[PDB]
Design a binder for this molecule. Sequence first.
Ligand SMILES: CCCCCn1c(=O)[nH]c(=O)c2[nH]c(Cl)nc21
Lengths: 339, 233, 308, 56, 215
Amino acid sequence: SELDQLRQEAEQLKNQIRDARKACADATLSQITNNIDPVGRIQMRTRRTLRGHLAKIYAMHWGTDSRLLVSASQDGKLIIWDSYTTNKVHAIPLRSSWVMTCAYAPSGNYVACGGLDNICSIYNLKTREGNVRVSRELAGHTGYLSCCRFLDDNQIVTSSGDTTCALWDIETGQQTTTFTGHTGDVMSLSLAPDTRLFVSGACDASAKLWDVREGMCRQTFTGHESDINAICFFPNGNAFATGSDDATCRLFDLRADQELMTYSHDNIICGITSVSFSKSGRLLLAGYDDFNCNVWDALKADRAGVLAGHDNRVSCLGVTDDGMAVATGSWDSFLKIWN
Amino acid sequence: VQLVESGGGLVQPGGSRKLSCSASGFAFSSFGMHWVRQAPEKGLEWVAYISSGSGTIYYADTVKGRFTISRDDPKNTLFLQMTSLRSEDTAMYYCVRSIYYYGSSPFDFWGQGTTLTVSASADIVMTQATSSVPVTPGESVSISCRSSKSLLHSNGNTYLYWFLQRPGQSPQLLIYRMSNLASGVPDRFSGSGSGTAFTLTISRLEAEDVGVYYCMQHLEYPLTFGAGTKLEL
Amino acid sequence: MNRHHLQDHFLEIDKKNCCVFRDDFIVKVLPPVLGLEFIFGLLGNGLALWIFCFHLKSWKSSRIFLFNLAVADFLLIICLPFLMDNYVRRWDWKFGDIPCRLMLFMLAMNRQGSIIFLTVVAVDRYFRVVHPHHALNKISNRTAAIISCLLWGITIGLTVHLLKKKMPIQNGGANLCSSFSICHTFQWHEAMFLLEFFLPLGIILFCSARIIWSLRQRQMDRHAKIKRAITFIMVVAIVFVICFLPSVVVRIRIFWLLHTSGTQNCEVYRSVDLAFFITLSFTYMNSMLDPVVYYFSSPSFPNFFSTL
Amino acid sequence: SIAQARKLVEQLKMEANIDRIKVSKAAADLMAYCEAHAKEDPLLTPVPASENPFRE
Amino acid sequence: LSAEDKAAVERSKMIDRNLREDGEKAAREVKLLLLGAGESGKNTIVKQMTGIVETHFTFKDLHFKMFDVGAQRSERKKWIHCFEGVTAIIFCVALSDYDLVNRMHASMKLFDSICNNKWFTDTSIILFLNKKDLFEEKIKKSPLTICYPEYAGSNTYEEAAAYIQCQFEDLNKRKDTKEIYTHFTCSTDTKNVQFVFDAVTDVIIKNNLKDCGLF
Ligand SMILES: CCCCCn1c(=O)[nH]c(=O)c2[nH]c(Cl)nc21
């Protein structure tokens, strides 16, 4: 049919989506969560501070054991940090120094890297020779790599700077499934606890849920008014929080198909760089461009606490699987552990 | 990964020789070395240890000062120099690589070793309960040992390693830290302990398991070793 | 009295012809100037030290040397009121031998260290400007600290000899407290005093001229901060000269008067010592003006001052 | 070509088939788990330094 | 206390020493950013010396690192901040673009966006006006006023090139902090690298003076 007819059909479907969304708006999260007691002031201290890096830190990820973490910086080095003792387990000399993302395999055997260069590098931590080396170079992407997350020891899903998100196979090193739903740049990813679905944030203020196996969009959320820099899954896997440059964080529910609550405040005019959840999901820790990190109560949507142990932008924010401690990287080249 | 060693022979007492080993297939500089000696009838015994950075060099009490250990990272070769060796030194020496980090598997690889012949306290003692136990294929056998001091460090890691010396070849690491199996080791092996009493379980015994089983403690130097338990098929 | 009052002017401290005078103009001039200098240097060094504890991350070799200079100036101004007390009593040291020894040693060490540190700062600026690439070899903070410690050690060593001498000699109810005594011999202390101005002055002039040439040949017209830096670099040398030169000139006059009117006869040479002590007061004037010339020069220091 | 939009129509049809639940019960299903695991969270309730694995 | 963790600490200290050596090496090297529409001009600039393309060349005992971002074809707002530490930025625009389809206006827009960027507040820009020889003939054939209706002057290479230079320079709102080193280059032999080296040395002098506090 003609383009105008297709646009009319799209508008009618959009109106139907609006009607469906409003029909399910029984109540807001605030009035229902008013029945629970406020979390109260949350005080955290910097038990451990890491000064190994010499350049700006941009991404980090916690391991399954809740002991080892991997950090990435533009100096071109990946450092596996022993949180308890601060020892440097490994130091990977990156081929490309322009790295803005990293990931840790669930089993700890492999790590991921990516950034301005479109190639994705996977390193073997448990090689016989004892020296970490590159296993594969996934260069199928055309745009700059934005985020990477390990689904298993053989499958990895990464989001690039182009409009396409790809699922990769370590055994063959080819794009098994490619996602092209997003129209703008894709910033961050987040794997569900069941490792079956994942949400991707994009610069077009659109959050879309993808099926790892089926490989098509399942839901779309458009509650933000700017680019979505960060996204993370709820511990129970039925919700996720979105961080955006418009100085507001929104929690989306997969069943309700709409935002439940908005985290924003008048003094906070800066953007959000990273977002993470605690083990229980009660506390939402989100990074901010100002020299501090704010802890938000996911239910009551209030500033439980503020971490002002940084003097530069808080690029990344990682939380241990068991919730023992929270790691907050920043551009000051120092990584700190909070609990 | 190979470790070729040379420098054996027969020498009269009071002489001096320099054992040498060539390391290939792995980053020698990144791996710390150890030296272990086999008496003709006795068990393994540690000699010396040089770290990756050539620092923190340690020697056993019976060889302190008398022997020195040096390494050449650029040449990827290890030299052990022996001076004024005595009759008690007659043994077969093995070179052992080691790497120290969380989750590491030190003493995983052992060299073939060289034969050396000479013409005519304050350490943890490995009290092995038994010296020899008969076994049959398809059976299960438990090997236990005693330690003077509990190896359970405050960090929760007990420093207990197990080694198997099949006849005609060097020892092979099986379990390290009594809860982790070395690479290439069948999963049927299992170990457990309470920090002072230890037991090694070998389910579904296979003919390839014949040999002498040796213990190791790494809590405090010197790395004293047990008598060794031999299994006969 | 035989030979009038000259019989008392002659003292023979350790060598002959020592001629510290009595009953002259020093009381009317020195104390107020010393007081104003002490107050100003005190407040300036206090504020400088207080802000120095706020920028540890940006604390580097140049700031290391600047902090060393601040410490030297603070010590000298803290020693100033002892000299004020001495001068109000007009050469009658109330305190004992050890306090006088410490005061003289600290004065010498602090002034020489301040001169050395400002010379090293000028050399660092010259290296940064004329040789931008070579300057990167000295950014090591540990190396800067070692260099500062070595400079302090040298300064102490050249001045420690003042301690090994029973200084407080007595004259007519007044216990003399001065290291400068117009001795009849070329005592090494005055030669060191002379070279401490001769060599650092030349080094500062050379560094300033080289910086002037390099900056004016390639960037002067571009942006005003270059003009500000040029003007303040010139001002540093101008202040150093106009403040330290008079002392050197008067001491050169004293040495030139080795034949007569400085030895074998007196009571006509009073004005020379009188002016020499005003020149020392001017040296202290420069010492307390140092932090205004150096620390307030940087555009960030006004921001820090406004914030505090 | 209209097949591309037909795929989207089919996916919307699949979407409409979900058997949804009231949000109030959905929200309440989140409660009653924190209270039961209130003592199990090291962060919600302070952990003594003796039992904490991060003490210096 | 530690028994075997001391070996891990020693390994960590060795790793830290290696990291310090690498950081010193990186600090010694000077980083340059390449920007400009059109692959031909940037290729000519590179020869006169898949994502990010890195070119390494040493001039007068100084190691220069140049980064290529044209091939990325992505929104600059999401990755331009990565180049905060670049000592200088090289902008390449062909003077002949004024007659092709509007390209000069796009280059001016890109230059305005880069020069007014918050991240590049204290980074100098080196402007290279490429294809001077082609501009010589284009002026003789096409007038400069096609893309600049406000332009009014003699149709000569000197006047037109000067007018282009002023037009590009006035876009710099931060005239107090930024310094634009405009230059003319078509096929210059050992002249372009001299200019870029001089600009980088001036930027290094400015940074050193700022560090010392004089600026
Ligand atoms: C440098 C040698 C130790 C201090 C010598 N000195 C000085 O340099 N200026 C003085 O005004 C002064 N007064 C007294 Cl008494 N000693 C003084």
